[PDB]
Amino acid sequence: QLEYPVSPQDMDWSKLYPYYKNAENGQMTKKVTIADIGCGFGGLMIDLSPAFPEDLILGMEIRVQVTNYVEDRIIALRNNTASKHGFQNINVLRGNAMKFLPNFFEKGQLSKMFFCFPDPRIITNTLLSEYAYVLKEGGVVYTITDVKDLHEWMVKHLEEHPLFERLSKEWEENDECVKIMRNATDKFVACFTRLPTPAIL
Template sequence: MDVNMDTSEALILPQKKFYRQRAHSNPIADHCIDYPISPKHMNWDKYYTNIKEKKVEFADIGCGYGGLLITLSPMFPDTLMLGMEIRVKVSDYVMDRIAALREQKPGEYQNVACIRTNAMKYLPNYFEKGQLKKIFFLYPDPHFKKAKHKWRIINKTLLAEYAYVVAEGGIIYTVTDVKDLHEWMVMHFEEHPLFKRITEEELKSDPVVEKLFASSEEGQKVTRNHGDKFLAVFRRIADPFIS
């Protein structure tokens, strides 16, 4: 049973075995995905109730089965959070899971939603400049072969997009069980002028950090296999070239 659900939830939530799909998807391939031509063309009312003037502030990129979203929802009840997942069946599961939780617990989980999309291609189509306060990359596909490193969710080009959609002071969290990928992500973030790594001492006061390791299905799998987990967190800083 998912560690993020109690017994009553387990009785009515959709079952993952009916939503299983390949663990990885080619982010470069052309997928049949509907996406807005710009953030102002995105209709968020279909995903959140009573949205009014609110905007999405947390984005879980490659959200998997939605464990982190469900964990953070009651911690930040006034913050809109979005899971972005490229796999069809997996995103369907998260949508159905959220719908089931909303029905079971009226008034709760209204601040989380999931869409099927390719964040590597369309992230700026959903979010305005400086809109996001937190982005999460939990156990992203390592793309082990050197020829496929360009498919990694953290690279020079995409970091420019993340710097665009994240507000100054906003946080990007990365967790992986692959040391090589961890070092790759750290290297690229540290080379970028708009990101600064947050020290371990600073992270002790961040309530989100302890939820990153086991809230997702992948994190639970790593725990069961007694694998390593590598964390690196970065803050979006002001542009040093603009006075």
Template sequence: MLQNEKISTHSKSTGLPRKRFYRARAHSNPLSDAHFPVPISPSHFELSSYYPQIFLSPGHADGKKKIQFADIGCGFGGLLIGLSTIFPETLMIGMEIRDKVTEYVKERIIALRATNNNGDYQNISVVRTNSMKYIPNYFEKGQLTKMFFLFPDPRFKEKNHRRRVISPHLLDEYAYVLGVGGIIYTITDVEELGEWMKNCLEDHPMFEALTKEELQVDPAVKLLTSATEEGQKVARNGGQTFQAVYRRIALSL
């Protein structure tokens, strides 16, 4: 290869970004500070740059729309893409702390929008942020209807359990931004973490488990094991997964 020949980070056939150029560590320290902008309040979270066709295009502009789904630690964006066409009228966002992974998802969405002239994928986007610190900066009280936590970092050491993305303290914040009836979806291939997340949700006064019948008819549940890179890897290896899906309820007085 010539010395000045540029290596393309995107596939020539599909226009999609090549994942190998955006690889990063599997997880990041959620307690560390990173250099990225954070809105001071939800009203300062400018959506037009994330969903330009919906907010800026003539004939499409809808300034009243709000984000309803949040994929926390969205990884390479598989769940967002799977949900996008199932819920085409719903704005959803991935929240990812790793810069290279966030850039990959951004480029992936741009490429999908460009190659789908029917308006698909205009309702999804991604933001680089630390959701364990800044959830209230992005969403108003009761704004969200679904939150996803797919294959989060297990944080095996007991001293690091405080860094887990599902914890009693953080569930208070998630309950704040979830409307009554909103749903939290969790899945992991680590049994101990699965029990931890289930117990945290079960013990919280503002969440109740979905019934088996409700789980069977929920289209989002079907994507938990198939849409993400981690879920596909577990399936290929014949591994087991542990789900906990809970509904936000009104606090009983």
């Protein structure tokens, strides 16, 4: 049985990210800002951790065994570390991104969303509207797979949705996230910017 908040504002993040709890206020000093959708065994997260030390990164997986594995994995990383902050910005929870994203994240909360080696649909014309909701204007969707068909599927829906625009190969070659993606345990990549919403005042 999944655990998820009644609203994003009811979500207690101080248990997953205890290092960013203000001891005085009892408040969070930081918010989750990067999301790994289908994080699997947590590799991409591990590599993102030191690359984005100012950012809270959350992985989501639906498989229970896999999430328990990852919890233990990061707990270890945290204790096997010298500094008082090593891997403190990274964590996972068991959850269904296709359904409850808006329970966890406020509107425009995330800067980045990763879908790396998705299982041959978390990408759908219909699901994209919900992702657009939690991803800020200017935020990006990162995509890597070894399945050509899967890559072309992801590309077609992202490009057809009015709220997403593909980033150029030149952009990818300069982006650190793309490098980290390409180096996480025949690789087709696509990235997309979350376009600003047309003003309906």
